[PDB]
Amino acid sequence: IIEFHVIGNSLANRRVLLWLVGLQNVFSHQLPRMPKEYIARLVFDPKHKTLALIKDGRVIGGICFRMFPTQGFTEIVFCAVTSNEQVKGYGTHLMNHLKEYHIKHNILYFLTYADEYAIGYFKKQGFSKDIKVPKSRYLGYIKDYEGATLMECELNPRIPYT
Amino acid sequence: IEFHVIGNSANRRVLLWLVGLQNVFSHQLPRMPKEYIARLVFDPKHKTLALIKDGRVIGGICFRMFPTQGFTEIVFCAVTSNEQVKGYGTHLMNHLKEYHIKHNILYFLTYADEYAIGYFKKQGFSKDIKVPKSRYLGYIKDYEGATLMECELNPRIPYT
Amino acid sequence: GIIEFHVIGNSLANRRVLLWLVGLQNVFSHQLPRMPKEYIARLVFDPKHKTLALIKDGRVIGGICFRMFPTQGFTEIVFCAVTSNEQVKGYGTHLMNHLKEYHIKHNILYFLTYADEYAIGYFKKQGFSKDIKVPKSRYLGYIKDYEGATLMECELNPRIPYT
Amino acid sequence: GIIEFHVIGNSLTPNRRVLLWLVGLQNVFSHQLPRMPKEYIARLVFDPKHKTLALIKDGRVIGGICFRMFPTQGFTEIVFCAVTSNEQVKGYGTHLMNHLKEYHIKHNILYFLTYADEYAIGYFKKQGFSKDIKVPKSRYLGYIKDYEGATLMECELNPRIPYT
Amino acid sequence: IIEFHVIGNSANRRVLLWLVGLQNVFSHQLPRMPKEYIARLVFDPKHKTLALIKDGRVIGGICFRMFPTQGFTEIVFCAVTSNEQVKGYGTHLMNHLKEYHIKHNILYFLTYADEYAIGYFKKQGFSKDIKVPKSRYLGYIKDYEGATLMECELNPRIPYT
Amino acid sequence: IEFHVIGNSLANRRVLLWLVGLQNVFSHQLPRMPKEYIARLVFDPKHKTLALIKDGRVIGGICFRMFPTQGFTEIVFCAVTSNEQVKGYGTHLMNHLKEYHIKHNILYFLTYADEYAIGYFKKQGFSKDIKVPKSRYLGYIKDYEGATLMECELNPRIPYT
Amino acid sequence: IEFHVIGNRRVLLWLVGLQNVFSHQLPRMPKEYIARLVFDPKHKTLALIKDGRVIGGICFRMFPTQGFTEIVFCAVTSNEQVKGYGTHLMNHLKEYHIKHNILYFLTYADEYAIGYFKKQGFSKDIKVPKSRYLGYIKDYEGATLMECELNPRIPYT
Amino acid sequence: GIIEFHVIGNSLNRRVLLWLVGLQNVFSHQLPRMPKEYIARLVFDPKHKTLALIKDGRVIGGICFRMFPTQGFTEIVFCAVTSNEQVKGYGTHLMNHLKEYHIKHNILYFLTYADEYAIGYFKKQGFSKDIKVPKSRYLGYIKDYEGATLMECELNPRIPYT
Amino acid sequence: IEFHVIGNSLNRRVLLWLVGLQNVFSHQLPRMPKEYIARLVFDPKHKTLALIKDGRVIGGICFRMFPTQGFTEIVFCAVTSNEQVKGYGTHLMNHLKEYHIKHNILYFLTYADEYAIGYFKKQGFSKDIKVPKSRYLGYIKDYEGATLMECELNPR
Amino acid sequence: IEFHVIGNSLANRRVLLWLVGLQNVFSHQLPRMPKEYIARLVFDPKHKTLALIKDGRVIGGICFRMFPTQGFTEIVFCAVTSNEQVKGYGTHLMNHLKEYHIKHNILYFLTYADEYAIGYFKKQGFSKDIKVPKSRYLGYIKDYEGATLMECELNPRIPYT
Structure with missing residues (x-):
């Protein structure tokens, strides 16, 4: 009984709002030192979406x-x-x-x-440390942090992933 | 500080406050399922003094x-x-x-x-329920293992 | 096969929710086949009654x-x-x-x-009991009394997911 | 006979002669290119941000x-x-x-x-394309679908002469 | 999964891409029919397709x-x-x-x-004996060269599905 | 050249003048049908004309x-x-x-x-063997005695232009 | 001491006060330019x-x-x-x-202000791409372009 | 040498706002001992206007x-x-x-x-210390600042001043 | 003398001014296809200081x-x-x-x-290109034989 | 090859650039008539141009x-x-x-x-003998001192195209 939903904050539906609270709960737990308030602001930012x-x-x-x-x-x-x-x-x-x-x-x-704790999952999913995108195209949009490993995944639009 | 009576219907400041409240309730009462605390805090007939x-x-x-x-x-x-x-x-x-x-x-x-009984007793609550059982049963949610407490308010004396 | 659950009520326009309703009228009146079919119809099609189909x-x-x-x-x-x-x-x-x-x-x-008599087993199966907690003053005159029969009660727990 | 050129494409809202032309184009591209999925060719021809000169x-x-x-x-x-x-x-x-x-x-x-x-390079050479890319990599990377076999080619256009 | 959807025009583009998929499939399996003919009918409003x-x-x-x-x-x-x-x-x-x-x-x-599809329609209940009067189908259904007119009568009391 | 399917709708200064022209050429290649009759059909809302x-x-x-x-x-x-x-x-x-x-x-x-149209209709694919049943056309099409009914069947898959 | 993001009477007066404070504590620049920026409805001011x-x-x-x-x-x-x-x-x-x-x-x-921006954490090493700020921010001989990166992992108040 | 005379004021449009701020800056510089907030409150009072x-x-x-x-x-x-x-x-x-x-x-x-520093300009412009307006007509509407000199100018509609 | 920053937006005083500008650019630059000069002068995102x-x-x-x-x-x-x-x-x-x-x-x-060199020089234009090719490429319309010239601004 | 009667009425993308082009053509085959004059006429509303x-x-x-x-x-x-x-x-x-x-x-x-246009107008049927009374054109057509007044009379039954 598994389904996948791409949801996000528009501002209607309650199930979405409760889902987004569930996602915030999940993320906030697995990632403790990041402030709960901050994970919520991101999950409830309209420009962010979540595949739930x-x-x-x-x-x-x-x-x-x-x-x-x-x-x-x-x-x-x-x-x-x-x-x-x-x-x-x-x-x-x-x-x-x-x-x-x-x-x-x-x-x-x-x-x-x-x-360091996520690199393995991203490696398994096909992400690589060789960034083909130039730095002048992502820097300032994605949140760069000292000590974080930038990883990239290139998608082949000719193969059906699902 | 700031005191606010907030609830769900819009406004995002309030809604992020609700999530904050839900995390505080869920944290302090690990007893309760996270999804249950969320369902109530975001229920429109429920409201919260934040x-x-x-x-x-x-x-x-x-x-x-x-x-x-x-x-x-x-x-x-x-x-x-x-x-x-x-x-x-x-x-x-x-x-x-x-x-x-x-x-x-x-x-x-x-x-x-009984972790909370001490707090309610010191806020003025009592175990002797004056409100008739026919007025509250099936309106309030009964959590077995907890004890029902009641507080009567004096509308003539000031609290804040 | 594909199976679905929807609570289909009635307000004041849909096609098959009605035809679902007459089917419901039929299955109730087929498995409860001595109560007047019109009664089952009036209840099934009453606005404030709903049906989990x-x-x-x-x-x-x-x-x-x-x-x-x-x-x-x-x-x-x-x-x-x-x-x-x-x-x-x-x-x-x-x-x-x-x-x-x-x-x-x-x-x-x-x-x-x-x-x-032929439904008590089903309700015991589903958690209902003969020991009523809701006071008489709050159900009497509201639920259709039908007293050649047994008043049974089920208290739900809001914490658990039932589905 | 009656050779016409039309820049067509899908919209978010809306014409039908266009739709059948879009299906034809999808049929020509797909037939001429049979290891690429037909569904991907359809998804591109019918993408609103894509246009086709039919x-x-x-x-x-x-x-x-x-x-x-x-x-x-x-x-x-x-x-x-x-x-x-x-x-x-x-x-x-x-x-x-x-x-x-x-x-x-x-x-x-x-x-x-x-x-x-490799089967298109000759056509693009005769139409004025080159393997010498003047557009900087910092500009097209990630916008255009790269592929590890293809040959990136560029065509520079003169805006003062008339190409028709 | 398998889904059945009756689609057509009025449309969407999950529908339009489904119609293009249908057109592609009809054209590959029926190299008899021209591709632009199949597209015209699959995309005709008065036509529908069970996809x-x-x-x-x-x-x-x-x-x-x-x-x-x-x-x-x-x-x-x-x-x-x-x-x-x-x-x-x-x-x-x-x-x-x-x-x-x-x-x-x-x-x-x-x-x-x-010639190649007659067997299939036999398996699905069709016959070569046409009780619909010729005065009611001629000019309405399209004749195809050398094919065979075949007919199926339905029973409203069987739910085939 | 231009081919225009025009017709009087129950307005457009030009198309009516065209319609008057078609009425003229119809009446002068058929110079003894009452021009009043040609005019009423050419300008009838349910008749149209490939001009x-x-x-x-x-x-x-x-x-x-x-x-x-x-x-x-x-x-x-x-x-x-x-x-x-x-x-x-x-x-x-x-x-x-x-x-x-x-x-x-x-x-x-x-x-x-x-007299003068038979060979033309033969040229264009018409036949004196009528597939369409008499119950389908009698009373709908304007009949003549002496004139010859002719029929053309169209193949929907070839392009005619 | 109150903090307000602004950009109503009380607000307009407050923005003139900001233009006065800026133009005095920064007498280089035209008061006309300072006023233009202060009163742009897209510029904002933490007051x-x-x-x-x-x-x-x-x-x-x-x-x-x-x-x-x-x-x-x-x-x-x-x-x-x-x-x-x-x-x-x-x-x-x-x-x-x-x-x-x-x-x-x-x-x-x-130069009159760089020392302050360092105590606040700014540096002259510019991680941000030029094609990001070009045409959006306004150049001077501001001695240095200076950047400060912010870390959300920390409440700042 | 493009010069312009404009009567502007606050409604009870923005190059009026910028001109007002310049005027407040002018008065604030010339009167360093008045509070600049007071000069602002007046310049931006709707009941006040300014010939710019x-x-x-x-x-x-x-x-x-x-x-x-x-x-x-x-x-x-x-x-x-x-x-x-x-x-x-x-x-x-x-x-x-x-x-x-x-x-x-x-x-x-x-x-x-x-x-004291303004009297000579006003005198040059036809102002006089002899006040013909009765005291019942201005007192309390304008403020009699201790140490200021009340001065008056009587205008003539038959004169073309520009 | 008036200076106006004008152009086509989506007005005839402006319109004949545009045609006038197109003629002056056409006459002084007398072998550039005037269809091109007009196409730009009337392009809604090109502007002209008249x-x-x-x-x-x-x-x-x-x-x-x-x-x-x-x-x-x-x-x-x-x-x-x-x-x-x-x-x-x-x-x-x-x-x-x-x-x-x-x-x-x-x-x-x-x-x-070849004829525009002098004007730009006196306006301060130089033949050294301090804008990297990484940016003017694809936005300014490259001219083959011409000389790219740059002018750095006075700020205020 | 197309023909269009265009002009400022009270435009669109096409017609304005077409009139700028027309003004350039007129201006360069009359290369010493003031261009401001040619543009004002080309864009005058009561003026039209067959392009x-x-x-x-x-x-x-x-x-x-x-x-x-x-x-x-x-x-x-x-x-x-x-x-x-x-x-x-x-x-x-x-x-x-x-x-x-x-x-x-x-x-x-x-x-x-x-001088460079007389021949053309002769070849188009124009005459130097003006049958329109000077009581009728003076003050309506813009005179041109030194130019030759020429007139063409049209036949309304003649189809010219």
């Missing part, structure tokens, strides 16, 4: 991303599956569903700044 | 007025962990009492954990 | 017909039926569970019902 | 150039480029490219980029 | 034109992509089509079957 | 009456001015007419032909 | 209000689609300087930009 | 006044020419344009309480 | 503002022959520059043919 | 001023670009102009012709 992993009407994971169709890439912001539902293949389905969502919107590059 | 410190939620009381029945359900009470023992729990309850006096609601009802 | 591939298979009393704090379960074509498949339970979550989201935590 | 004979589509304009960056990407088999070697490809050149001059876009497969 | 969708992708369909005034429906294009043939999808398709037509009070299918 | 116009002048046309409910179209008047004859204008007029009708799902023409 | 009177402010222009803000004017009026209001002003501006999710500050600043 | 002296789109002088049409007189509050455009006859023309404006608005009396 | 004696056009500068890249393209500059050698060309460039200080910009780039 | 559009370019035109109240039309400017002359364009322009005026019942053209 739903089981039985219930949020168990998702990816918070920020599209920059002006620049040709999407920033991967938050990326988490709740601890009870891990190691079930959900993190890959989440990423693949985000990749097909993005080729159908003519965006073919993901960019993210990753902890 | 304790704000510099645009930031540090406490609150989620309550549901039943004006037709003549009482209010105290649902959630929390002051954030790093801000307690400053008198905020008492100031929040009092603001709530004066809010209800101005709406002719002079009875609070709450189901309290 | 269990539908698969368009055909109606089951339903629970209920009338919420949110001022009084309870809902009346008037009709419960799965068509004999699809019994013994746990659909009676899936129906009641979807009814339970629907009412939890509407802050109604008590069901009340009058059960005939 | 080559029309007797109202039937016999060729086209599918392109996407990037006015913010100052170039256009040539996506698909085809002429029907039984109408080739009739000089229609050159006429198609020239109307596209004229169309892009009028819109202040004076650079064409394209990732050519 | 067989798998993974959000078109794999089969039955394009038909309803003649409610004349009391029958014309089966125009009928195809399942090669990878999914011999899976019983052609019969599920026709079944859902018969159900769709029972609920619109159309109980007679007419079709012209080429 | 063959050159440099803004009417040189030929086909006046017709479509019966979509009945499945056919009536050819009523068919002519090319006496100067512009013997240059293939009557066939190109007939071919644009067929293209128009195939796009409108009308695949049968019916007409009554006089 | 430092004491007893209802303007004693300082920071005038800035957010470019939320480009992910930065230009620091135009920074001034505390002279009889309030050594009290450290300049730092509280900058902390309120940083914190305000995190809430509105903008993390790079850009400013052209006098 | 403009050159090349830039306020170089002005006269801030308040009309009392119910009382039949106007108060000159502020009066200044920026100090490098002085001694060019601009102070005369500023006051003359103000005279023309007021006779076309049926006001024939200027009143002003003058600095 | 130098207007009487109420008629006696000179002008057609330019094309490119903010995100930090420079404006000068396409056309001409004073008609009667009012040449009074320095109107230099007054024009001064009104252009000052209009550009109040507006977004501090750089001028132009492709100058 | 010769080879494909999208203007290659020729006739600027005329109708005086329907006075029974004639003033030919103002008349020019074919240097490329396309001695290709017969000047005659077809004039003929399209003649038919346009026939359809508006204006059957007299008056024009003042310089």
Whole structure:
């Protein structure tokens, strides 16, 4: 009983608002030292969207991303599956569903700044430390931080990810 | 500080306050399922007295007025962990009492954990329920293992 | 096959929600086949009554017909039926569970019902009891009394997900 | 007979002669390019941010150039480029490219980029494209679909001469 | 997954791309018909198509034109992509089509079957004996050279689906 | 040259003057039908005419009456001015007419032909063997005794232009 | 001491006070230019209000689609300087930009002021691409273009 | 040498706002011992207007006044020419344009309480210490600043002042 | 003499001024296809500072503002022959520059043919290219044989 | 090759650039008439211009001023670009102009012709003997000291195009 939803704050629906509170809960827990207030402002920012992993009407994971169709890439912001539902293949389905969502919107590059604790998941999902995008195109849009590893994924719009 | 009676219908400042409240309630009552605390805090018939410190939620009381029945359900009470023992729990309850006096609601009802019984007893609540069982049963949510407490309000004396 | 649950009520325009309703009228009146069919029709098509319809591939298979009393704090379960074509498949339970979550989201935590002899087993199965907590002064005159039958009650728990 | 050139494309709202021309173009591009998924060719021809210069004979589509304009960056990407088999070697490809050149001059876009497969390079060479890219990498990377076999080619347009 | 959707024009573009998928499939499996002819009919407003969708992708369909005034429906294009043939999808398709037509009070299918499609329509209940009067289908359904006129009568009391 | 399907709608200074021209050439290539009769049909809201116009002048046309409910179209008047004859204008007029009708799902023409029109209709693909049943056209098309009914069936998959 | 982001009577007077404080504490530039920027409805000013009177402010222009803000004017009026209001002003501006999710500050600043911008965390090493601010911010011989990167992982107030 | 006379004021448009600020800057510089907030509150009072002296789109002088049409007189509050455009006859023309404006608005009396430093300019412009307006007509509407000298100017509608 | 920053937006006083400008640019640059000169002068995002004696056009500068890249393209500059050698060309460039200080910009780039060298030099244009090719490429219209010339601004 | 009667009425993308082109053509084949004058007339509302559009370019035109109240039309400017002359364009322009005026019942053209235009106007049927009374054109057509007044009378049955 698993479905994938691309949601976000428009300002209507309550289930969305509760989903976004669930996503904020999930992200905020897995990522403690980041202020709860800050994760909420990002999840509830309209320019951010979340691909939510739903089981039985219930949020168990998702990816918070920020599209920059002006620049040709999407920033991967938050990326988490709740601890009870891990190691079930959900993190890959989440990423693949985000990749097909993005080729159908003519965006073919993901960019993210990753902890040391996330690098492995992004590596598994096909992300690389060789950034083909020039720095003059993402810097200032994606949140750069000292000590973070910029990683890139190139999407082949000719293969169906889902 | 700032005291606000907020709720759900728009406005994003308020809505981010609700999420703050939900995280505080969910944190201080790990007892309760996160999704349940969210469902109530965002219920329109529920509203919350938010304790704000510099645009930031540090406490609150989620309550549901039943004006037709003549009482209010105290649902959630929390002051954030790093801000307690400053008198905020008492100031929040009092603001709530004066809010209800101005709406002719002079009875609070709450189901309290024994972790919370001490707080409600010192805010004036009692285990001896004057409101008839026929007026509240099936209106307030019964959490078994908790004990029902009631507070009667004096509309003539001032609280803030 | 594809199976769906929707609470189909009635206001004041849709095509098949009505045809779902007459089907519901039929399955209730087919499995409850001694109460006057017109009565079942008037209730099923009453505006303040709703019906949780269990539908698969368009055909109606089951339903629970209920009338919420949110001022009084309870809902009346008037009709419960799965068509004999699809019994013994746990659909009676899936129906009641979807009814339970629907009412939890509407802050109604008590069901009340009058059960005939051939439905008491179903309600015991689903958590109902003969020990009534809702006071008489709050249900009497509201729920259709039908007293050759048993008043049973189910208290819901808002914390748990039923579906 | 009655050779026409029309810059067509999908909108968010709305015409039907255009829709059938878009299906024809999707049929020509797909047939001429059979290992690429038909659904991807359809998704591009029907994307609103993509336009196609349809080559029309007797109202039937016999060729086209599918392109996407990037006015913010100052170039256009040539996506698909085809002429029907039984109408080739009739000089229609050159006429198609020239109307596209004229169309892009009028819109202040004076650079064409394209990732050519090996079977298209000869056509692009004869139409004035080069492997020497004057547009900076910092400008097209990520906007145009790169591919690890294709050959990036560029065409510079003269806005003062008339290409038609 | 498998979905059945009756689509056409009025449209959308999940629908338009589905129609292009349908047109592509009809054209590959019927190299008999010109590609622009198939596109014209698949995109004609008075035509509808029962689209067989798998993974959000078109794999089969039955394009038909309803003649409610004349009391029958014309089966125009009928195809399942090669990878999914011999899976019983052609019969599920026709079944859902018969159900769709029972609920619109159309109980007679007419079709012209080429040499290669006659067997299939036999398996789905069609016959070469046409009880619809020639005065009511001639000029309405399109004749195709050398094909065979075949007809199916529907029973409103069977839910085929 | 231009081919324009015009017709009087129940306005456009130019198209009416064209319609007057077609009325003239119809009446002068058929100089004993009451011009009053030609005028009423040319300007009838349900008759339309494929006008063959050159440099803004009417040189030929086909006046017709479509019966979509009945499945056919009536050819009523068919002519090319006496100067512009013997240059293939009557066939190109007939071919644009067929293209128009195939796009409108009308695949049968019916007409009554006089002395001078039989060979023309034979040229353009017409036949004296009538496939369309008498119940479908009698009373809808304007009958003559002495004239010869002729029929044309259109193939919707070839392009006629 | 009250902080207000502004750009009504009380507000207009407050903006004239800001133009007065800026033009006095920065007598280089034309008061006409200073007024133009102060009263642009797209420039904003974090105003430092004491007893209802303007004693300082920071005038800035957010470019939320480009992910930065230009620091135009920074001034505390002279009889309030050594009290450290300049730092509280900058902390309120940083914190305000995190809430509105903008993390790079850009400013052209006098030699007369660079020392202040360093105590506030600015550097002359410019990580931001030129094709980002070009044509949006206004050049001077501001001795240095200077950048400050903001970290949301920390409340700034 | 493009110079312009404009009567501007606050509605109870923005190059009026910028001209007002320049005028407040002018008066504030000339009167360093008045609070600049007070000069602002007056210049931006709607009941106050200012005859702006403009050159090349830039306020170089002005006269801030308040009309009392119910009382039949106007108060000159502020009066200044920026100090490098002085001694060019601009102070005369500023006051003359103000005279023309007021006779076309049926006001024939200027009143002003003058600095020690301003009396000689007013005298040059026809002001007098002999006040014909009765005290019952201005006292309390204008402020009698201790140490100022009340001065008056009687205008003639038959005279063309510009 | 009036200076007007005009252009086509989506008005006839302006319109005949545009045609006038197009003629002056056409006559002084006499073998550039006038369809091209007109196409730009009437392009809605090209603008022209019209130098207007009487109420008629006696000179002008057609330019094309490119903010995100930090420079404006000068396409056309001409004073008609009667009012040449009074320095109107230099007054024009001064009104252009000052209009550009109040507006977004501090750089001028132009492709100058063999006859335009002198004017730009005296306006301060130089043959050294301190704008990297990474930015004027694809926005200014490259001219083959011409010489790219740059003018750095006076700021205020 | 197309013909359009255009002009400022009280434009669009096409017509304005077309009139700028027309003004350039007129100006360069009258290279010492003041261009401000030619532009003011070309863009004057009561002035119209029959434009010769080879494909999208203007290659020729006739600027005329109708005086329907006075029974004639003033030919103002008349020019074919240097490329396309001695290709017969000047005659077809004039003929399209003649038919346009026939359809508006204006059957007299008056024009003042310089040395380089007399021959052309002779070849178009113009005469030096003016049958329009000087009581009727004086003060309506703009005189031209030294130019030759020339007149053309049109036949309303003649089809010129």
